[PDB]
Structure formats: C-alpha cells, structure tokens
UniProtKB/Swiss-Prot annotation:
The chain holds residues 2065 to 2224 of 2224 of the full protein. The gene is F5. Disulfide bonds join C2-C157. It comes from Homo sapiens (Human). Coiled coil: none annotated. This is Coagulation factor V light chain. Changing R38C: In FA5D; impairs both factor V secretion and activity. Residues 2-157 form the F5/8 type C domain. Glycans are attached at N145.
Length: 160
C-alpha cells in the first residue's frame, strides 16, 4: 500500500523542510512558525498561523525527493473560545520548488477545492485520487474560521 504517514507528526519531516508565506508572531514571543503545523501537536504554540488572513497564504512541505502523496489530514487549533481552522483549501505541488501546479481533477478545469475542518481538533482526511507524484506540497487556504491555522499530516510512499 501507499499510506504511510510521511513524517509531520513523528518528526521525520524536519523543521527546515516546512516553510510558509508568513507566520503570526505575537507581541510576547509566541511564534506560530510553519514547522509547528504537526498533527496532534499540543502546547502554547501548537500550530502554524498565517501572519495575515488573506488569499496569498500557503504552507509548504519539502519532502526532499519526489514521492507519491496519497492523502492529507488537517486540524485547526484553539485557545479559549477562539477556535481557528481552515475550512477549505487547494493543493499545489512541484518537483523543484519553482513553478507550482494546482491539483486538478481529470474532470475539471478549475483547482480542486478540498473540504477542510469544521472544528479545532477533529481530523479531516482527504485522499488524492489520483495521487500526487511530486517533491513539494503547498496547502493553499481558501476559507477559514476566525484565522488561518493548521496542524497536518501527509500520507504516501516512495516512488519505485
């Protein structure tokens, strides 16, 4: 099969491999850095939060080599009554990290909009049918509740 978690939660995907368009930095040292977006992460700062909530944000994961990505799971995060989570998003990919291609269904002429979370800790998994063969993956938030925030995991396998 090709459904092994690629390394977000377990740390195989190192901090250096995860970057973003921007990240929230609070007045009091809380940096919601891109590499904090790891499935089930707990703590004060436990997720990536964009610096600004707009249509120019993205979270990128560099798998270091071309792999087969079969699925993705996302979560949001919470702090009191403030529930943050991405409600829908598109996926972009690339073999070199330069020039990005949007994930599009065979039957569609527009970017595939993926249904995201409806709460802060619930896991919402989406399968790529067909799978993505690439090295870099970018989650492009389209809609969100309160603020753009993510915790995620990627699933797949190597190319053989």
């Amino acid at each position: 099969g090709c459904s092994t978690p690629l390394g977000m939660e377990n740390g195989k995907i190192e901090n250096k491999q995860i970057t973003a368009s921007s990240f929230k930095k609070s007045w009091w040292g809380d940096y919601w850095e891109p590499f904090r977006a790891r499935l089930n992460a707990q703590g004060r700062v436990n997720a990536w939060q964009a610096k600004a909530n707009n249509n120019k944000q993205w979270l990128e994961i560099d798998l270091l080599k071309i792999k087969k990505i079969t699925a993705i799971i996302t979560q949001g995060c919470k702090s009191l009554s403030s529930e943050m989570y991405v409600k829908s998003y598109t996926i972009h990919y690339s073999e070199q990290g330069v020039e990005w291609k949007p994930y599009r269904l065979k039957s569609s002429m527009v970017d595939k909009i993926f249904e995201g979370n409806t709460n802060t800790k619930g896991h919402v998994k989406n399968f790529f049918n067909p799978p993505i063969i690439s090295r870099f993956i970018r989650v492009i938030p389209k809609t969100w509740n309160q603020s753009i925030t993510l915790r995620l995991e990627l699933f797949g396998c190597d190319i053989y």
